[PDB]
Amino acid sequence: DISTFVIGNEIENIKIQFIKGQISVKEMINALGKSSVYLKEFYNPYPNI
Amino acid sequence: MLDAFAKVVAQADARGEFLSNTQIDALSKMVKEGNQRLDIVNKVTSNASAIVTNSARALFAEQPQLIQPGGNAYTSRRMAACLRDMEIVLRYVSYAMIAGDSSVLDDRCLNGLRETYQALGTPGSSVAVAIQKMKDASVALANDTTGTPIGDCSSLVAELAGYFDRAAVSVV
Amino acid sequence: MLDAFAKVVAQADARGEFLSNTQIDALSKMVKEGNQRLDIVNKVTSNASAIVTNSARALFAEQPQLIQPGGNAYTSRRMAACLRDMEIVLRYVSYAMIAGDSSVLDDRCLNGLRETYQALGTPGSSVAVAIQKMKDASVALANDTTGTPIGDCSSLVAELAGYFDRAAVSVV
Amino acid sequence: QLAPPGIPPGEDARNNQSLRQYVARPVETYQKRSFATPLPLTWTGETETVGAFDVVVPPQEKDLPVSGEATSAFVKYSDMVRAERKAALQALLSASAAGEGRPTCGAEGRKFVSNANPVLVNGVKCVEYWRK
Amino acid sequence: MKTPITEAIATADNQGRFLSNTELQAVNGRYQRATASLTAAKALTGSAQRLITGAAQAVYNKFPYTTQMPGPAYASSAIGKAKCARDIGYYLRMVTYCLVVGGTGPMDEYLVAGLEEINRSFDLSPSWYIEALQYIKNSHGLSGQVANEANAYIDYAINTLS
Amino acid sequence: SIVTKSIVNADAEARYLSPGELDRIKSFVLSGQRRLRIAQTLTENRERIVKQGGQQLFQRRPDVVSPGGNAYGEEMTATCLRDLDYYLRLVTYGIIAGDVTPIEEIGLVGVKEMYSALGTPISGVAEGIRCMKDVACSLLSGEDAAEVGFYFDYTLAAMQ
Amino acid sequence: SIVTKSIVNADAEARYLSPGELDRIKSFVLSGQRRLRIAQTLTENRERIVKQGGQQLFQRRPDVVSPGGNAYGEEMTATCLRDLDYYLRLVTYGIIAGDVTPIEEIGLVGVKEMYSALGTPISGVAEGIRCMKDVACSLLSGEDAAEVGFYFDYTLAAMQ
Amino acid sequence: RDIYNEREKIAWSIIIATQGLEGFIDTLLNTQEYLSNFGDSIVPFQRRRIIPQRSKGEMPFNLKTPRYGIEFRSKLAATQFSWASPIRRFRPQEQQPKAGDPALFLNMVQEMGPG
Amino acid sequence: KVIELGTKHFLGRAPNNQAEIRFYNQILASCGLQAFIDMLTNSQEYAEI
Amino acid sequence: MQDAITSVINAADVQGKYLDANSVEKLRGYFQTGELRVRAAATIAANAATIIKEAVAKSLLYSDITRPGGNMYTTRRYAACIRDLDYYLRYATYGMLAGDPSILDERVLNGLKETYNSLGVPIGATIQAIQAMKEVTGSLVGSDAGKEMGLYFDYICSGLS
Amino acid sequence: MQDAITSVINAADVQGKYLDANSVEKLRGYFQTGELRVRAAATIAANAATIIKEAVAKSLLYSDITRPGGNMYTTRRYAACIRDLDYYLRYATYGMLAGDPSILDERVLNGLKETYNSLGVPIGATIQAIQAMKEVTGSLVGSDAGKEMGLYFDYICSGLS
Amino acid sequence: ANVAGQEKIATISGYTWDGQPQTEIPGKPFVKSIGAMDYMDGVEGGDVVAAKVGAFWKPKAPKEVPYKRPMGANTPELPYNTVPRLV
Amino acid sequence: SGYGDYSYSTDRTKGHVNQYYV
Ligand SMILES: *CC[C@H]1/C(=C/c2[nH]c(/C=C3N=C(/C=C4\NC(=O)C(CC)=C4C)C(C)=C\3CCC(=O)O)c(CCC(=O)O)c2C)NC(=O)[C@@H]1C
Ligand SMILES: *CC[C@H]1/C(=C/c2[nH]c(/C=C3N=C(/C=C4\NC(=O)C(CC)=C4C)C(C)=C\3CCC(=O)O)c(CCC(=O)O)c2C)NC(=O)[C@@H]1C
Ligand SMILES: C=CC1=C(C)[C@@H](Cc2[nH]c(/C=C3N=C(/C=C4\NC(=O)[C@H](C)[C@H]4CC)C(C)=C\3CCC(=O)O)c(CCC(=O)O)c2C)NC1=O
Ligand SMILES: C=CC1=C(C)[C@@H](Cc2[nH]c(/C=C3N=C(/C=C4\NC(=O)[C@H](C)[C@H]4CC)C(C)=C\3CCC(=O)O)c(CCC(=O)O)c2C)NC1=O
Ligand SMILES: C=CC1=C(C)[C@@H](Cc2[nH]c(/C=C3N=C(/C=C4\NC(=O)[C@H](C)[C@H]4CC)C(C)=C\3CCC(=O)O)c(CCC(=O)O)c2C)NC1=O
Ligand SMILES: CCC1=C(C)/C(=C/C2=NC(=C\c3[nH]c(/C=C4\NC(=O)[C@H](C)[C@H]4CC)c(C)c3CCC(=O)O)/C(CCC(=O)O)=C2C)NC1=O
Ligand SMILES: CCC1=C(C)/C(=C/C2=NC(=C\c3[nH]c(/C=C4\NC(=O)[C@H](C)[C@H]4CC)c(C)c3CCC(=O)O)/C(CCC(=O)O)=C2C)NC1=O
Ligand SMILES: CCC1=C(C)/C(=C/C2=NC(=C\c3[nH]c(/C=C4\NC(=O)[C@H](C)[C@H]4CC)c(C)c3CCC(=O)O)/C(CCC(=O)O)=C2C)NC1=O
Ligand SMILES: CCC1=C(C)/C(=C/C2=NC(=C\c3[nH]c(/C=C4\NC(=O)[C@H](C)[C@H]4CC)c(C)c3CCC(=O)O)/C(CCC(=O)O)=C2C)NC1=O
Ligand SMILES: CCC1=C(C)/C(=C/C2=NC(=C\c3[nH]c(/C=C4\NC(=O)[C@H](C)[C@H]4CC)c(C)c3CCC(=O)O)/C(CCC(=O)O)=C2C)NC1=O
């Protein structure tokens, strides 16, 4: 769950957009994977390998 | 039985804490309406028999089966009970309107009315249609000037209609 | 409501037969204690308010949630009801101790107490912990010397503790 | 058999009710009325109470003395480790050897840890089956 | 809950009648009395911590034996002083609730119903709380009808304690 | 830090820092001296800032220190002033770093969860931070106060 | 444990337990009941044993509680009584195990190093153990006291 | 006495709603059932609660019906742990010691007296 | 590591169990290298193989 | 995961056996306590936040670990640890409903000590917080359900130590 | 190594506790079965060679592993494997006397799979020979002692697999 | 939910301490109270510091439309001589 | 590694040892 490693205003517009039925599951997952949260957790602390 | 002033205090004792200033200007503004609210309840209690009889007459001109022989509205006593069941809900809606909170409405009027009407075989949907027809006449009668200063009362008639819909969904 | 003497008679009428001599010297022994039993109930009724207040004080120094705002022991009426609910169980335990049988304890104290506490939302396990803390103080106060002849009372304080445990398992 | 509870027999209100406004009657029993709850028998000789004559205080620590087999066999066993026990005590007492090396733990802590069990070290042997 | 609203409703329901002009006037009195009571509630909220500490100190100065005598009922130890301050805060909270509500509805429900049972069992003198309430009445620093309305709910608690 | 953030944002794209990022790093290292001066002024006036912010908070929110409030009692009030001191220290860190990374990584990520688990109203903390912001900006010049309140505003936005 | 030690001593030689070792295991399991009884008596009289041993120690060795002694002060005296309780517990373990393996593996291996690193005189601990031995043997029968002091004597020998 | 069946509560629920509490228990006390058993001169009581030879009874009416039931529990029953800001502890571990703590022997050193 | 190299060169095998490692670790603890060599060569295992 | 029923069926099936009298014994034992288990699980679901709050307040709220330098100093770490305690409570409730701690082995304890050691989380403080949570939980659910829940709480503490 | 008594004493000592009622329960349980354990150990010491001979004859004596190419073809390998089976039987007897399989962990199973894998010894055939030895041993010592011995036989087989 | 309650944004109906759903009318679960504050504006985010929700820079339109427009082809056609029970 | 970063070296805290008198 995200709430221990985010402030709260990072993926809010992505959540509101999916709850309204504007984006599919795949678009929400794609937008989720290219957020600043994913960059901070699984890209910055590790090597590319 | 609570009024709207009682409700914030009953939620303030629970946390054991003083009312902050935002709750206080929420309450002074509410008070500052004040006269409008009692103008509303004055208009409903001045015309209560007319509301009830016109709603019942529209109900039976609409649904003739209740006064058909064998209907639930049959017999001199069952019509007399149906006449002022509606007047009971009108009385408790006016109590909840003057209180600012639907605490007297839930506690003595709508508490256990559903299985009361189930145990008698009374169709609760027709009671709800009667409640809706009393509601329409009450909000129609509420927003006329009739010698009152001109202003907006919209947030009060929305609450008055909300009490009627709360009564209508709880019966059925 | 039976005493221990009426127990054997109520089981003697059922078979329709006279009490044999073994039941009789079972009963003359029970008479021959006699004074010890009333010394026990005298010690509990002399100190009843102390037992109840010290047990309640230990209960709230232990479980502070009941007196926390929102708790089951909050305000002035719920604490007043909790104070002497314990005094009711102490009274009926003393009645059952003087009777020699837990027939008055089941009839008019423990009969329907569980769904009474369920219908109110009262936590029955905390009532049981309060019963246990009254029990410990009562058996501590029972076996003490206060200008009384030295002897053993062990079979009586075991029965006194058994009444308390019967009250404690039936509430929860 | 009988009409539902409370309903006066013969004057139901659902008699000729239409199907488009008929309400199903909820079932009601006498389970919650006070007269219907089961009492103790107590005429068949069954009082469901508790009192004197059912109190028992059995001792579990010193219930009463223990068997002769355990006693005789403890005396037996004690007549078996006595020689070796006194020999071990004798080996401990006069085994007052000196130390060597810089102390690691206060003034003690020299080459050997005190009271270390030697059988753990010397009791595990390297064996070569078909030895060299 | 005793408000001017709910007692008017209770008087209309006892006859089983609609709300007459009697009830509407009784409600209108609450409405043009409320403006000073809400100011009293704001002002007693703002000065709360200071008044509780001063009232506890005034009780300790008037009755010095409460800080010296050993026993659970006295404020000789630290938990006793904490519970004494908790009780004074309870009294001030009920006074503010009665101020904003408009009658002695909250404190009748929360404080005085079964009050002397506690003072008799837990062996607490009501004169201590009387001395605290007299300090709170003397030291709230209000003026006019704000003072007249706060004092009138203070001495109701004083009258019930006596 | 601005340098760190520029380096990561350039690292994800697998490129060196463009001349814009280097320009901005240069401008930052050139302003570092007044950044340290402003951090000085805010740092060594901490007692007055915390005290006067605590006052404005307790006058604006009397419920938190009212009988039973979250900060009710001597110890709880001391703990609340401790929290305000924490946030002032974080603001000084952010001022010297040139970016809210220190403030946000320490004290903002998961602050709602913590304060909900503690039973503290987050709006009271926001009020305290706003009061401290006014008190602290009162002691700075025009441009300095503008740049310093820049971080108090971010801390308030994150703490809604 | 006697069973454990017999098993290891038979394991090193790569043989099953001879009938002598099995005889001794049998005699041990037969005496286990009075072993548990003796452990009961010593176990549940621990307060008097520790108290009266501490007295005899402090009267025999006033220097350890004299001003500045290792056990000087309330806290140090409490810690010394704690140590005596440790050793009484170990003696009960050894009584039920039928052998000093529990006592020696816990509390005897490296005891000199520990007490030298702590600055405690080991002779004082030996005196305390002897005093506890007398107090504890006073509460047993003749044969029981003989068998129980059998372990106190080993603990004293190891603690020279 | 107990209610006969649930239809009787439906029957008498209406006098409260129309004629007030004052007209409800007006009609209740002027019944033949009240004047038959208690008259004007006798405090009422539960009639025939116990069957004579039996021990057990039929749940006296204060226990049978408390102040509120299931209908109102959902609304004004209390709770545990209601975010209620208690009086704090500051040292919960020091209150009772652990196993190897020498704090258990502080009530023993006075007992050992050099005299 | 010095303990394993000692047993390998002077006894032709690895350390046996954990109790053997405590015996040599304390010899290296207080006496040092030359005392460790003396315990190995003067052992009863050395004498018989 | 396998509950009591699954474990009995597996023990019977791994021998080609039909469910005999001992399996019936265990199955009846589980079926008798199921209703108490459901009651306890409902009550625990009702008061999870207050249980965690009270356990943290009694165990590590004012100690030095919440102070600068402690493992749970910053707000990130405080939130992370309260989330961990929520995990422990929820999985103990699952284990109590199932009557079998295999879910704790599969979903909680597998690689937990190693994660805590790599992160630097103090194990003793965690075990003490779980012990404090056991107190409050047994308190709230009564004696029998408290012993049931304490079984799995102690299982987690033993797997963590 | 630790037996049942040592394990109980350790569990009690690791908590600063005195031996309470549950420890007494376990200790009585061991003391009641000790005499049966001694009887079984004596009987097994009496007939070790015949047990190993019969297990080898029923498990792998005429299979292809004893022919050219199989593990244990030559006389060296046959002797080595019968010595291994003797080890397993002796250590299972030790574990049965102690009532605790820790000796099997410390003296037998530690690094055994790795040695067998480096040598090329088939693990399945070894487990089957141990299973056949379990049959003969339970046969010779009767039902209760056979279940006791089979506990540690299955422990060895699980540690080897 | 406790945050939403504590900051006076809205009351969320939860459960009782023993796990049963809260409700003001015992028919269905999670039925909450109403009145006098469900119809007040400018208190959408009350007690939240500087909550800018909507068009905060101005007061809002007077909210009046007290007339009924005949619905053409969109009047909800219901059955005659009966009541739509449920749906 | 970031800003709020735990180190045993910089941990002056009795969290790894339970000294509950501090
Ligand atoms: C528009 C009329 C609708 C209708 C009414 C109806 N009601 C009944 C019977 C009863 N109604 C009640 C209701 C109340 N009692 C109360 O105290 C309160 C205050 C909260 C209410 C709302 C009761 C107790 C009865 C039974 C007693 C009686 O009336 O004699 C009846 C028929 C009478 C009978 O069932 O014998 C009718 C016809 N039913 C409809 O068809 C209309 C939709
Ligand atoms: C230590 C106090 C525990 C506790 C008590 C508690 N009880 C209630 C409410 C009631 N208790 C009864 C009980 C009895 N009535 C009887 O006639 C008898 C004789 C056999 C008993 C035991 C009843 C009828 C009530 C409801 C009436 C009322 O008290 O107003 C209450 C709260 C009051 C309420 O629910 O509004 C408490 C607090 N509860 C605890 O938390 C303690 C463990
Ligand atoms: C016995 C009880 C009792 C009362 C209710 C009041 C009745 C009343 N209402 C208003 C005053 C008012 N009454 C209304 C109400 C309305 N205007 C409309 O156009 C709508 C039809 C209706 C809304 C439902 C408004 C809007 C005002 C105030 C004018 C304003 O706010 O601009 C005033 C003038 C004094 C004042 O403004 O405060 C009075 C005496 N007095 C009483 O003694
Ligand atoms: C009003 C009621 C009432 C009473 C209870 C008795 C009180 C009382 N008890 C005893 C007599 C006694 N009382 C006790 C009781 C005790 N001794 C102890 O050490 C225990 C603390 C305690 C047990 C609970 C015993 C044991 C005897 C008799 C002495 C004996 O049997 O050896 C006697 C002496 C006469 C006799 O022995 O019969 C009297 C007058 N009298 C009364 O008028
Ligand atoms: C407009 C359509 C319409 C209907 C069809 C009926 C449907 C209907 N029938 C009955 C009621 C009944 N219906 C039957 C039917 C039958 N009896 C038998 O023996 C056979 C099975 C079958 C006749 C061939 C009976 C016996 C009753 C009476 C049931 C009773 O009193 O318990 C009732 C209950 C109300 C009442 O008692 O009248 C209703 C709603 N009503 C309607 O409004
Ligand atoms: C609803 C509002 C409310 C009131 C009024 C209230 C009073 C109250 N005060 C109590 C105790 C107490 N009250 C005090 C207070 C004082 N004693 C002194 O010596 C001082 C002079 C004085 C402080 C000014 C003390 C010391 C106790 C503890 C007494 C005991 O535990 O025996 C107790 C006993 C339960 C407990 O231990 O907390 C109650 C119920 N509780 C409430 O919930
Ligand atoms: C020269 C560098 C070097 C070091 C440091 C070293 C350490 C080392 N420490 C050991 C054990 C140990 N080390 C400790 C240490 C500690 N326990 C604690 O709780 C503390 C945190 C910590 C002390 C500060 C303990 C208790 C053991 C014994 C383990 C056991 O008996 O199971 C052992 C096992 C050997 C034996 O004692 O038999 C070695 C080899 N070896 C080396 O060559
Ligand atoms: C560096 C970032 C950071 C922050 C902010 C932080 C906060 C933090 N605030 C705490 C308590 C607290 N904080 C408050 C604060 C308040 N009460 C109010 O009413 C006001 C709204 C508010 C003051 C403005 C109170 C009263 C407590 C004690 C709560 C209790 O113990 O019940 C605690 C628990 C005890 C402690 O201080 O160690 C932590 C860890 N930790 C961090 O690492
Ligand atoms: C379902 C079973 C399960 C558990 C339990 C689990 C724990 C777990 N705890 C973590 C961190 C953590 N856990 C804690 C916990 C604590 N700090 C203390 O002082 C206390 C003793 C303790 C709480 C009682 C803290 C502070 C961190 C953050 C470490 C850090 O940010 O460096 C992390 C790192 C992930 C992250 O937060 O980014 C994981 C994966 N994962 C799982 O899958
Ligand atoms: C390459 C070196 C080598 C040898 C020698 C060897 C021997 C060997 N001899 C065997 C059996 C046997 N060997 C004999 C031999 C004899 N009976 C007598 O009386 C005579 C003295 C003797 C013949 C000269 C018998 C009877 C068996 C079967 C025993 C039985 O199954 O009971 C078996 C078991 C079954 C089998 O043949 O696979 C092996 C493995 N294996 C090897 O790898």
Side-chain angles (χ1 to χ4, degrees), chain D residues 14-120:
Chain D
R14 309 176 208 248
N15 214 55
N16 208 20
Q17 272 197 7
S18 296
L19 170 54
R20 74 191 72 170
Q21 66 188 49
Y22 183 80
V23 184
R25 168 185 274 120
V27 194
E28 183 196 351
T29 49
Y30 293 112
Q31 283 307 103
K32 300 172 290 296
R33 312 272 46 92
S34 52
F35 77 97
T37 187
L39 308 155
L41 274 300
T42 191
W43 56 268
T44 70
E46 180 39 45
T47 82
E48 269 298 351
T49 63
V50 175
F53 311 127
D54 67 33
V55 286
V56 55
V57 179
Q60 67 88 15
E61 297 84 2
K62 178 69 183 132
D63 60 354
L64 283 181
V66 72
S67 63
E69 282 61 37
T71 305
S72 76
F74 202 141
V75 172
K76 200 186 168 189
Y77 178 85
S78 305
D79 346 285
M80 276 193 244
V81 293
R82 177 171 302 124
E84 44 176 308
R85 273 180 187 183
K86 64 182 58 176
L89 274 185
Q90 181 68 45
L92 289 181
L93 288 183
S94 68
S96 299
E100 185 185 296
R102 184 194 62 109
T104 58
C105 309
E108 287 298 332
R110 292 171 144 182
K111 190 196 290 203
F112 306 114
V113 172
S114 51
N115 301 324
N117 185 13
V119 180
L120 301 175

Side-chain angles (χ1 to χ4, degrees), chain J residues 72-147:
Chain J
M72 59 188 276
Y73 163 58
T74 86
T75 61
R76 184 184 48 87
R77 289 164 186 169
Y78 197 101
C81 193
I82 55 186
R83 175 216 58 211
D84 274 25
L85 289 177
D86 198 17
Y87 281 157
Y88 295 140
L89 194 52
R90 182 160 56 80
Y91 278 99
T93 302
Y94 291 154
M96 185 264 306
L97 285 171
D100 202 342
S102 70
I103 183 180
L104 302 173
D105 274 317
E106 299 167 11
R107 305 270 294 141
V108 173
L109 289 183
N110 176 17
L112 184 59
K113 199 188 327 184
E114 258 96 17
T115 288
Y116 275 176
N117 273 323
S118 329
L119 289 169
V121 174
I123 299 290
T126 305
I127 286 174
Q128 197 186 350
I130 297 173
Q131 289 298 305
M133 206 152 55
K134 175 157 78 83
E135 272 33 20
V136 186
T137 312
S139 97
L140 238 93
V141 301
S143 330
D144 292 356
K147 246 213 221 190

Side-chain angles (χ1 to χ4, degrees), chain B residues 73-88:
Chain B
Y74 203 53
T75 77
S76 258
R77 202 203 45 108
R78 293 199 247 136
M79 185 70 247
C82 194
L83 267 175
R84 56 101 197 163
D85 263 348
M86 317 164 60
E87 223 201 346
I88 284 180

Side-chain angles (χ1 to χ4, degrees), chain E residues 15 20-21 23 30 37 41 45 71 90 104 109 152:
Chain E
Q15 286 76 322
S20 324
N21 276 334
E23 288 83 83
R30 173 78 187 99
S37 2
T45 311
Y90 285 165
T104 86
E109 284 325 328

Side-chain angles (χ1 to χ4, degrees), chain K residues 47-94:
Chain K
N47 304 113
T50 186
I51 288 171
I52 291 168
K53 175 178 186 288
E54 275 197 359
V56 163
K58 199 203 56 202
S59 153
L60 51 85
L61 197 47
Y62 264 122
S63 95
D64 148 62
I65 70 172
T66 78
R67 287 169 170 71
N71 207 249
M72 102 200 233
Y73 163 58
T74 85
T75 61
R76 184 184 49 87
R77 288 164 186 169
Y78 197 101
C81 193
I82 55 186
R83 175 216 58 211
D84 274 25
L85 289 177
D86 198 17
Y87 281 157
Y88 295 140
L89 194 52
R90 183 160 56 80
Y91 278 99
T93 302
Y94 291 154

Side-chain angles (χ1 to χ4, degrees), chain B residues 32-40 42-43 142-146 148-153 156-157, chain E residues 21 24-25 28:
Chain B
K32 183 260 181 181
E33 298 309 316
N35 300 110
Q36 280 98 304
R37 178 181 300 273
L38 305 170
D39 287 5
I40 288 274
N42 181 45
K43 289 185 174 307
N143 45 21
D144 30 31
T145 82
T146 9
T148 54
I150 318 282
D152 49 358
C153 292
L156 293 193
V157 261
Chain E
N21 276 334
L24 307 176
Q25 293 161 73
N28 206 18

Side-chain angles (χ1 to χ4, degrees), chain B residues 4 11 15 22 29-30 63-65 100-102 106 111 114 125-126 152-155 158-159 162-163 166 170, chain L residues 6 8 11 24-28 31-37 39-40 47 62-64 66 81-85:
Chain B
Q11 300 188 340
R15 303 193 291 140
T22 35
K29 170 200 310 301
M30 202 169 190
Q63 300 190 26
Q65 50 193 6
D101 188 29
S102 84
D106 306 329
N111 218 336
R114 179 186 290 112
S125 22
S126 319
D152 49 358
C153 292
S154 40
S155 323
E159 179 195 2
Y163 291 143
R166 182 179 187 86
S170 135
Chain L
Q6 178 178 38
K8 271 77 72 169
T11 61
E24 294 288 322
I25 311 174
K28 57 179 175 184
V31 164
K32 57 163 55 184
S33 178
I34 50 174
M37 297 213 288
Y39 307 100
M40 198 166 294
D47 200 73
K63 187 189 164 181
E64 296 289 334
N81 281 347
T82 186
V83 165
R85 125 237 298 259

